[PDB]
Amino acid sequence: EVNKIIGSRTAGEGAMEYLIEWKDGHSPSWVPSSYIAADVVSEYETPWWTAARKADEQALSQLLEDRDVDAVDENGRTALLFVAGLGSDKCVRLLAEAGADLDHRDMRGGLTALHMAAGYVRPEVVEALVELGADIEVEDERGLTALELAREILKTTPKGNPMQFGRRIGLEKVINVLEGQVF
């Protein structure tokens, strides 16, 4: 009686739940992802997690419809975290418009979009996030905010070194952006 997945939503934590279209003709149900066959689930999710990684603006755009925008993988990441991490100002603003939860914390460390944009040193994204209204005071599972984490990474980057000198200017700008919110 499983015809296809025609929707999704997250449940509890790191756990998907899908809307089922039955062939035999009854009402659509919601089911725990583990109730249905793996390769059914896979063909549904795989496009999303592919696009998220390639930070593909338009794929994401059409895949949006009945899918939950904050669909989470097994580590509690959503496509917003991946795209923040890759620097796609666009994919961030797209997912933002669609209604993605800016303050989402993953479960392998408590990280958020901002922590990722700061971590992978993504100044433009950090700007977009603050501007779209992300909460900059949110803390990761070490208590560190996004800002503190830039500070912490910066400290440990070799100072009089011509090779890591690029990241240096990078981290500074991240910090410029965020501090302009606190002070």
């Binding site: 975290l81 991490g85 990722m116 992978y120 990474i153 440990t156 070799p158």
Partner: peptide, 12 residues
């Protein structure tokens, strides 16, 4: 951190 190292995602 392990140095400057930071790839919680896995992009390497």
């Amino acid at each position: 951190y392990p140095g400057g190292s930071f790839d919680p995602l896995g992009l390497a």
